[PDB]
Design a protein around this ligand. Structure first.
Ligand SMILES: O=[N+]([O-])c1cc(-n2cnnn2)ccc1NCCCCCCN[C@H]1C[C@](O)(CO)[C@@H](O)[C@H](O)[C@H]1O
Ligand SMILES: [Ca+2]
Ligand SMILES: [Ca+2]
Lengths: 83, 854
């Protein structure tokens, strides 16, 4: 089954989901990367409130989520500070 | 501005003496019996027919089609000043040969031609030719004037309440130059005046004397903060440049005349030392001047981002609130600036113990946001026995002195203050060592420096600067060295930021005063401008005049330093500044806060849009500055530099180009509904980068604009690299993938370059750790190859997208790169705009690759 953009703009194979290139006008195909300019990254942030952050802040080297999940491939190692 | 504080030429005794000599029969003649022709120099005595004073002319042909003229006294009572530390090396010479001689003339050939020099004996005259074309004349109007040193307003001289003891009396030197065929001359910053220099016949000469001019006004020849004695002449047929290497107060007269321009230099002391740079193209002149005074220092990438400044941010919490404001309002910013109130009572290298008690922690918080900080360090030192800097400089005799041997004391920001003698190499070594992390306590690698008031500004001094008869290293007077004092401050500071890191990190230093060679040490800006529309307009000709003389890292305070700009003016200034090299918002102490998120949502969005465009273009800016660093070519360019034969561009100053690729015409009028954009070039096409509409040159296009419009056009035949993933700072972006924008020429071709490195070190030169890629399109193929193979870099940067303007719809797109199987790329095509988007090439930027459109 292929993926459908949440705005219906296109349909792409699921290998183009989180493939680090923006294919959906709403950014819905890259919830885990910094590829889309209008996308969002969800911090699950167990132990605190879960917040959404801009996709431009995934792997920017800055710790945005208290659980540190937004920095997984940047060289910055982020500690859990949700307490 | 209060003009009575500053001398006109009439109130300057040497300018009045020199300028009272009008064109006529020169009393100087060359004694051809004394002529001696050497390899590196021809020497011949000159004599004043009346005074019988004997001078020595040292004429040198130089490699790269340059001639150097030096004239000094034959038997001086005391040595005259020869400007040091400006020339990056001793210029390689070319041999002169005698190719003709009569009773009154000697013809000289440079190497084996085609450049010749004719020395006329009486009256003394020099003519420069390529073959039989006369290029330039020296002393053709007989304005040469050399005041010899007599026995120690001609002598003791007073201005207002300041007395110049003038122990050496009149020592001024002057010389004129004739430029046949030239009607347009440019350069000699810094002046709040038009790009094309005006004739001075009916008014004041252009003044070159580093001065602090409070609330300076526009379109007048008053001397501002910096002085670069370089004039460029441009015509349809050739390009020329004059480099008057003198550090004293200098006036420049320009007169028009078959069309011909005459240039006259008048300096207070020093020898006559002038370089003639013969082109023939303006890029030949750039290289010629760069070989003498060096090239623009490669800025660390972050300093090309957005700088947020004001006088002043209150304390650490304010700085951190500003930092958070940018992130909370989705606006990028690399550097926040700390003006003079961050220090302890304007004692530099210190921190205010209440408002900045823990500077290291503040710098650590900014480093966690991957942002920098800039702290101001001025070259005036408070007279204060509790101030360690003042005690060390006083105890070591490193201060400028008066004639009685005491340390000079003037008035500035901290009250009474002394001035380190930056012409003393021991003083500069001391200064550089003070920037070590152990001496400058509270500093960290992400702290950088701003040198201000280094004219030097002296509040109680004549014309708000240092007395003429102050004494510097080696006994030289301040009048001898004035225009390089700021340069020495810039240099010692830039050296300090390099040495504190052990020689690894590239510096960033902003300087207000400057001279020839200041491009080697960082950035400059046009000082205290005003929040008015005309000051927005004049930022273009002022930074263009600096670009033409080597200073590419130029900018003006965004929004204006004085007064409060209306919201629309602030928006238009961010759009203007976003396309200028040094991009900093700055503001006076009594202005309202104007951080970009404090405006209404409509103005915030247009300012954010402008910031995104600047950050997206960082790879393009970085490459232009690498080209300036290696070749000496300016980043910001007048339209005539790219179109030397389109005489309708010779005076344009509401429009400019970045490299050869982008033509910029910012909106600079309140309530404007359109701009007149001149798109030059025969057989040339231009793409509106916002609508992708293609326009054929030459034409004047009326383009409607809104508040969010920045009229920008890409030239056909260029490839512009961008980072389309805008983050909060450039450090966050420097490993992100590149998007290539290909604007096809009418022949279906394009080309461009891309430079990459670590972004902040000298590893590119000491380890050759960099990439220089060439991108080229022709036929139906886009090819990436190495433009410099010695450069290798470990980088994850890849090509995520290619945008082709002016292309038809292909049947298939094929990518090949070594080490990989042939790949098929999907694509999108807009038939109305002829734009082709290639999806995810996915190839490393360090790899050779080629994309074919079948
Ligand atoms: O007549 N007066 O108003 C006047 C008289 C006296 N005198 C005292 N004793 N005698 N005279 C002293 C001052 C003034 N002017 C008041 C302020 C305007 C000067 C601005 C200088 N601008 C530079 C410095 C800085 O303002 C902060 O470092 C930077 O922000 C900026 O970027 C720099 O260019
Ligand atoms: Ca995708
Ligand atoms: Ca992050």
């Amino acid at each position: 089954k292929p993926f459908t953009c949440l705005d219906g703009t296109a349909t792409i194979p699921f290998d183009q989901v989180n493939d680090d290139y923006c294919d959906c006008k709403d950014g819905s195909d890259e919830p885990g990367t910094a590829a889309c300019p209008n996308g969002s990254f969800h911090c699950t942030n167990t132990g605190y409130k879960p917040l959404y952050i801009l996709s431009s802040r995934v792997n920017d080297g800055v710790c945005d989520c208290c659980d540190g999940t937004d920095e997984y491939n940047s060289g910055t190692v982020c500690e859990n500070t949700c307490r | 501005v209060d003009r009575s504080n500053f001398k006109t030429c009439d109130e300057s005794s040497f300018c009045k003496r020199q300028r009272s000599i009008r064109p006529g029969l020169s009393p100087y003649r060359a004694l051809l019996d004394t002529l001696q022709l050497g390899p590196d120099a021809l020497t011949v005595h000159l004599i004043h027919e009346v005074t019988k004073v004997l001078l020595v002319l040292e004429l040198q042909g130089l490699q790269k089609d340059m001639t150097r003229i030096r004239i000094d006294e034959l038997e001086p009572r005391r040595p005259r000043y020869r400007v040091p530390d400006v020339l990056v090396a001793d210029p390689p010479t070319a041999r002169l040969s005698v190719s003709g001689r009569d009773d009154n003339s000697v013809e000289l050939t440079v190497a084996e031609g085609p450049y010749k020099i004719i020395l006329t004996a009486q009256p003394f005259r020099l003519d420069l030719l390529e073959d039989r074309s006369l290029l330039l004349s020296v002393n053709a109007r007989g304005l040469m004037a050399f005041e010899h040193q007599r026995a120690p307003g001609a002598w003791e001289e007073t201005f207002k309440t300041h007395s110049d003891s003038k122990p050496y009396g009149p020592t001024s030197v002057g010389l004129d130059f004739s430029l046949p065929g030239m009607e347009h001359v440019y350069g000699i910053p810094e002046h709040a005046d038009s790009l094309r220099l005006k004739v001075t016949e009916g008014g004041e000469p252009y003044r070159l004397y580093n001065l602090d001019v409070f609330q300076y006004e526009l379109n007048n020849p008053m001397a501002l903060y910096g002085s670069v004695p370089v004039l460029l002449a441009h015509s349809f047929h050739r390009d020329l440049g004059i480099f008057w290497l003198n550090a004293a107060e200098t006036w420049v007269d320009i007169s028009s005349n078959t069309p011909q321009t005459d240039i006259r230099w008048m300096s207070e002391s020093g020898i006559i030392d002038v370089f003639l740079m013969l082109g023939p193209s303006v890029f030949d002149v750039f290289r010629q001047y760069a070989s003498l005074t060096g090239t623009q220092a490669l800025p660390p990438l972050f300093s090309l981002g957005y700088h947020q400044s004001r006088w002043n941010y209150r304390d650490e919490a304010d700085v951190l609130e500003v930092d958070q404001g940018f992130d909370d309002h989705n606006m990028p910013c690399d550097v926040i600036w700390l003006d003079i109130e961050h220090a302890d009572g304007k004692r530099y290298f210190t921190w205010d113990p209440t408002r900045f008690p823990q500077p290291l922690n503040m710098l650590e918080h900014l480093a966690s946001k991957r942002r920098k900080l800039v702290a101001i360090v001025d070259p005036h030192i408070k007279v204060d026995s509790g101030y360690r800097v003042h005690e060390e400089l006083r105890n070591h005799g490193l201060y400028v002195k008066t004639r009685d041997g005491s340390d000079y004391e003037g008035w500035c920001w901290p009250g009474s203050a002394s001035y380190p003698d930056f012409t003393n190499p021991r003083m500069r070594a001391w200064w550089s060592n003070m920037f070590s992390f152990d001496n400058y306590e509270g500093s960290a690698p992400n702290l950088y420096v701003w040198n201000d008031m280094n004219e030097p500004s002296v509040f109680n001094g004549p014309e708000v600067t240092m007395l003429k008869d102050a004494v510097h290293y080696g006994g030289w007077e301040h009048r001898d060295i004035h225009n390089i004092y700021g340069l020495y401050v810039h240099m010692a500071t830039a050296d300090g930021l390099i040495q504190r890191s052990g020689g690894i990190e590239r510096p960033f230093v902003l300087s207000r005063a400057f001279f020839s060679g200041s491009q080697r040490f960082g950035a400059v800006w046009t000082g205290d401008n005003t929040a008015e529309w005309d000051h927005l307009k004049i930022s273009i000709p002022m930074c263009l005049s600096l670009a033409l003389v080597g200073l590419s890292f130029c900018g003006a305070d965004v929004g204006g330093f004085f007064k409060n700009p209306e919201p629309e003016l602030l928006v238009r200034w961010y759009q203007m500044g976003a396309y200028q090299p040094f991009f900093r918002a700055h503001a006076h102490l009594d202005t309202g806060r104007r951080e970009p998120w404090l405006l209404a949502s409509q103005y915030q969005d247009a300012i954010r849009d402008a910031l995104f465009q600047r950050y997206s273009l960082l790879p393009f800016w970085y490459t232009l500055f690498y080209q300036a660093h290696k070749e000496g070519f300016p980043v910001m360019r007048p339209l005539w530099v790219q179109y030397p034969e389109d005489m309708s561009t010779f005076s344009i100053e509401d429009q400019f180009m970045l490299g050869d690729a982008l033509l910029i015409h910012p909106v600079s009028d309140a309530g404007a509904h359109g701009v007149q954009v001149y798109l030059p070039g025969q057989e040339e096409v231009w793409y509106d980068i916002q609508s992708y509409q293609k326009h054929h040159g030459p034409q004047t296009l009326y383009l409607p604009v809104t508040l969010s419009s920045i009229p920008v056009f890409q030239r056909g035949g260029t490839i512009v690299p961008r980072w389309m993933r805008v983050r909060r700072s450039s450090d966050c972006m420097k490993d992100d993938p590149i998007t290539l924008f290909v604007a096809l020429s009418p022949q279906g071709t394009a080309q461009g370059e891309l430079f990459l490195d670590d972004g902040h070190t000298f590893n590119y030169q000491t380890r050759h750790e960099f990439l220089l890629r060439r991108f080229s399109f022709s036929g139906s193929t886009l090819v990436s190859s190495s433009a410099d193979p010695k450069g290798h870099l470990e980088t994850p940067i890849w090509i995520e997208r290619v945008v082709i303007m002016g292309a038809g719809k292909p049947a298939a797109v094929v990518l090949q790169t070594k080490g990989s199987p042939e790949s098929r790329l999907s694509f999108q095509h807009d038939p109305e705009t002829s734009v082709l988007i290639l999806r995810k090439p996915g190839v490393s930027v360090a790899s050779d690759w080629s994309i074919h459109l079948r």
